[PDB]
Design a protein around this ligand. Sequence first.
Ligand code: CHL
Ligand code: CLA
Ligand code: LMG
Ligand code: LUT
Lengths: 97, 100, 217, 159, 238, 42
Amino acid sequence: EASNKSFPRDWVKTDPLVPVLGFAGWTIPANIGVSAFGGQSLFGLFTQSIGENLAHFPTGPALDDKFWLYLITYHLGLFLTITLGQIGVQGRKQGYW
Amino acid sequence: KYGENSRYFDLQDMENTTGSWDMYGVDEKKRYPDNQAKFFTQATDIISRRESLRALVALSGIAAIVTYGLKGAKDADLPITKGPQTTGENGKGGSVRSRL
Amino acid sequence: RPMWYPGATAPAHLDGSMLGDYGFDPLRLGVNKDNLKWFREAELTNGRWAMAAVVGILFTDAVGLPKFWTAGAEKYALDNQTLALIEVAVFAVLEGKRYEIYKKTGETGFLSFAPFDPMGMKSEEMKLKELKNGRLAMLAFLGFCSQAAVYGKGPIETLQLHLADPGHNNIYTSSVGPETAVTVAVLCVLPMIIEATKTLNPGKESVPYFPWNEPWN
Amino acid sequence: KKAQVISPVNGDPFVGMLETPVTSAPIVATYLSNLPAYRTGVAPVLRGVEIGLAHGFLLAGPFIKLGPLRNVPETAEIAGSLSAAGLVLILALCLSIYGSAQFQSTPSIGVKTLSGRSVARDPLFSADGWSEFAAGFLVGGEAGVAWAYVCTQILPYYS
Amino acid sequence: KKTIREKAGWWSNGGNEKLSAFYGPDRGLWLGPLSGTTPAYLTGEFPGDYGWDSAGLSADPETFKRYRELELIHARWAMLGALGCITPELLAKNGTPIVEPVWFKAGAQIFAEGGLDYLGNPGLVHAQSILATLAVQVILMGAIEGYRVNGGPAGEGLDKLHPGGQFFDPLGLAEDPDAFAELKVKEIKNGRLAMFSMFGFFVQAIVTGKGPLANLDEHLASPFTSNAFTYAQKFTPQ
Amino acid sequence: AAQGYPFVPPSWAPSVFVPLTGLVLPAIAMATLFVYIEKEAP
Ligand code: CHL
Ligand code: CLA
Ligand SMILES: CCCCCCCCCCCCCCCCCC(=O)OC[C@H](CO[C@@H]1O[C@H](CO)[C@H](O)[C@H](O)[C@H]1O)OC(=O)CCCCCCCCCCCCCCCCC
Ligand SMILES: CC1=C[C@H](O)CC(C)(C)[C@H]1/C=C/C(C)=C/C=C/C(C)=C/C=C/C=C(C)/C=C/C=C(C)/C=C/C1=C(C)C[C@H](O)CC1(C)C
C-alpha cells in the first residue's frame, strides 16, 4: 500500500440511496401475502408482533412468542439486502466488474 | 523528510520514525467547570501524594476490615458469626466409630 | 540532651532540631521530614485535645455529673443528629483554616490568627512545655479510658481506690494485670537489647525493614 | 477495485498498528480522544475523579445484584456498595504503587499526534501526576459508589 | 464567537463582566429599561446602586455615605432578625419545646414562671430578670457599638463599614478584590431583601397577630381565600 | 487478662486476625515488595 497514508475519513462511501433502497427492496417484497402466513405477510406479522409486545411494554417478549422468528428473518433479509446494496453501489461506482 | 516519497526514517524526526505517536490524545485544557475542578482539586489535596494516599488506604482499610470483623460480619449475618445453631456433626465422627 | 532511656543514641533523623526530641522513634516513622512536620503538628493537636479532654473529664468527675463514657447518652437540648451536623459544619471551616495555617506557617492557628496569641507569651520554652504537657495529657486520657474500662469508675474514684490500698489496688491486681506486668518487664529489658544493637554495630545505623521506612536505601 | 480501507499507521508500514476502522474511524477516534484518559492537557486529578466516578458507579452493580447478600432485600445494596468501596480502595492502592513503580525514568523521546505537531508529554505520566491521579480516583470512586447506593435508594424504576 | 460552556459560565477565571452588571454605568437599574435618567451622583461605584434616589435624599455625598452606613447596618440587623425570627418557629415545628416561638411574643417569655428557657431547656440560659438582661445588654452593646465607629480591640484604623481584619473576616472570603466587590453587592442585596422581609414581619405581626410560619402555612393551605386581603377589613374605622 | 491462664485471646480475635492475615498484611506485603522489586538502583 504505497497509497493510503492517512486512513481516509470516508472509508465507507456513503450514498444515502443505499439504506433507503435496501429497506424498500426487502420490506415491500416483505409485505406480499403468502398462504403460508395465512394470506398475511412477514413484515405485517412482524408489525403485529411488535404491537402485541408493545402492549405489555416493560416486560419483554416470551420465548415461544413467534415474534423472534419474524424479527430474525426480516433482519436477516434486510441486512443482506442493505449489505449487498452498498456492495453493488460501490462496485458499480468503483470497478470490480 | 518523513511523510513523502516513502522516506520512513529521519534522524531529525525520530518520533515519526520510531512510532512515538499519540493516536488519540488531545492537549486541550478546556474540559471541566472551574468550580467543579476547584472542588475536586481541593478534595484530593491531602492525598495527592503517594505516601499520604497509602496512609489513607491503610487507615480506612484496616478500620473497615477490623470493624467488619467486630460488627460488620454480624450485621451481614454471616453464618460464621451466628454459629451452628444446632448440635452439629459432633457425635458422627465416623460411619463405623461414631466418635465425638 | 536527655533521652527516652538513659544513654540512648538518637536516630539519624531525630537530631535534636525539634523540641521534645528525646530520640524516640524505634519504628522510624519520622524518616521523611515533611512526614515529621505533619507528625509534629499532629502530636501537638492530639495533645491539645487530650489536654482539654483530661481537664474536662477531671472537672466532670470532680462533681456529681455523668461518667465520661456514658455522658453521650444523656438527653440534651438538641437532637443527636443536628448536634453532629452543626459540629461537622463549623469544624469544616475551623479545621480548613487550621490546615491552611499549617500549609502557610507550619504551626497551628485558630481561623486567621496564624499565631493565636492574644497575650504574646509564645516562646520555645512555652512550646516545649505545651508539647510535654500534651504528651502527658495524651497518656493521662488513655489512662482515664483504660482504668474506666477495667473499672466502672473515672479518674479520681480510681485514684482514691489506689490510695486506699496501693499494693493491692494497682494495675497488676486487676484483669489487665498480667499483660501489663509482662509488657513493663519487656519495656524495661528492651533498652538493653537496643543498646546491644548500638554497641555491636558501633556508629552504624540499622534499617528495621519497615514499609514506611523505604529500607532499600 | 479502488478505495482500500486498511492503511498503515500514520502511513508507516513498519511500525505495526495498521490503522483500521475500529482504530481510527472519525467517530471512534473522536470518542476515544474525548475520554478523560486522553485529555493530556487537563489536570490528572480531575480526569482521575471522572474515571473513578464512572468505575465506582458501574462496579457496584455486580456486588449488589450478585453478591452474597443479594437476596436479603435492603441489606443487598448496602453490602454491595461497601464491597465496591473496598474494591475502589484496593484499586487506588494499586494506582499508587503503580505510580511508585513506573515513573522513575522520564523517557526523553517526544510525542507527536499523527499530524506532526510535537505535543508535550502528558503530566499524568509523572510521579506527582499519577499521585494526584490516584487521589482523584479514590475520591471519585468512593463518591461514585456512594451515588450508586443513592440511585438504588431514589430511582423510581429500580427493580 | 462564544461557545456553549462559556455561555453557561463553566470557567470562573475569565469572568471580568461579573461586576459590569452591578457597578459602572452599564449596570442594572431599579425600573430596568424604564429608568432612563439615573441620578448623576449614584455613579455605580458603590454596592447596591440600582439608580434609586427618587426622593432625592442622597444628593449630597456626606449624607449619601451616612445613608450607606445606615443602610448596611440596618441590612445586617434585619438579616440577623429575619434569621432569628423564623428559626424559633422552625425549631418549634421541628419538635424542640420552645414555649412561645413566635418572635413578637418571645420577649414576654422572661415574665414566665421559669424565666427564659433558651431552647426550652432549664439547663440552658434560664434567665429570670428582664432588668439584669437589659443591663448587660446596654453595657455590652455600648462597648461594642462604641468600638464600631472609631475602632477598638478588633481593629482600629479599618473601614467603618467593612473592617475585615482578623476578627470580622476570619474565614477570609474577601481577600480577592473582585470577590470582595461582588460579595459587597451580594451582601447589600440580601440585606435589602431581609429589610423588606422584616418590614413584612412587622406588618404581618400587627394586622394578623399570628406566626410568620403560621402565615406561610395559612397561605400554603388556602392561597386565594387566606391572602393579605382577608385581613384588609381589620382596620376599618367605625 | 482472662480468668485462669491469662493471655487467652478474646472471642473476636479470629474474626479480626483472619481478615487481617488474609486481606491487610498481604496487601501491605505485596505493595512493599512490589515497590521494592520495581525500584531502580541510582
Ligand atoms: C421594567 C419593569 C420594572 C418595574 C415596574 C419595576 C418596579 C419596581 N422596582 Mg424594579 N422594576 C422593574 C425592573 C427591574 N427592577 C429591578 C431590580 C429592583 C431592585 C433591587 C428593587 C427594585 C425596586 C422596584 C420598585 C421601586 C419603586 C417603588 O418602590 O414602588 C413602590 C410603590 C408600589 C410598589 C405601588 C404600591 C403597591 C400597591 C400596588 C398599591 C397599594 C396597595 C394597598 C392595597 C394600599 C393599602 C395601604 C393603605 C392601608 C395605606 C418598583 C416596584 C425596589 C423595591 O423592591 O421597592 C419596594 C428595589 O429595592 N427593582 C431589575 C434588575 C436590574 C429590573 C430589570 O428590568
Ligand atoms: C498520666 C499517667 C498516669 C497516671 C498518673 C496513672 C496513675 C494511676 N493509674 Mg493509670 N493508666 C495510664 C496512665 C496513668 N496512670 C495509662 C496510659 C494506662 C493505659 C495502659 C493506664 C491504665 C491503668 C489501669 C488499667 C489501672 C491504672 C491504675 C492506676 C493507679 C495505680 C497505678 C497502676 O497500677 O497503674 C500503672 C500504670 C501504668 C503501667 C500505665 C503507664 C503509666 C505511665 C508510665 C505513666 C506513669 C506516671 C508518670 C511517670 C508521672 C505522672 C504525672 C503526675 C501525675 C505525677 C494510679 C492512680 C490502676 C488503679 O487505679 O486501680 C485501682 C489500674 O487498675 N491505670
Ligand atoms: C483557641 C481557643 C478556641 C476556643 C473556641 C471556643 C470554645 C468554646 C467551647 C464551649 C464553651 C461554652 C460554655 C459556655 C458557658 C457554659 C457554662 C455552663 O454552665 O455549662 C454547663 C454545660 C452543661 O449544661 C448542660 O447544657 C446542655 C446544653 O444542651 C443541656 O441543656 C443540659 O441540660 C445542661 O445540663 O457544660 C458544658 O456544656 C461545657 C461543655 C464545653 C465543651 C463543649 C464541647 C466543645 C468541644 C469542642 C470545642 C470546639 C471549639 C471550636 C468551636 C467554637 C469556635 C468559636
Ligand atoms: C431606597 C429609597 C429610595 C427612594 O428614593 C427614597 C426612599 C423610598 C425613602 C428610599 C427607601 C427606603 C426604604 C425602603 C427603607 C426601608 C427600610 C426598612 C424596611 C428597614 C427594615 C429594617 C428592619 C430591621 C432593622 C429589623 C431588625 C431586626 C432585629 C433588630 C431583630 C429582631 C428580633 C428578633 C431576632 C426576634 C426576637 O423575637 C426579638 C426581636 C428583637 C424583635
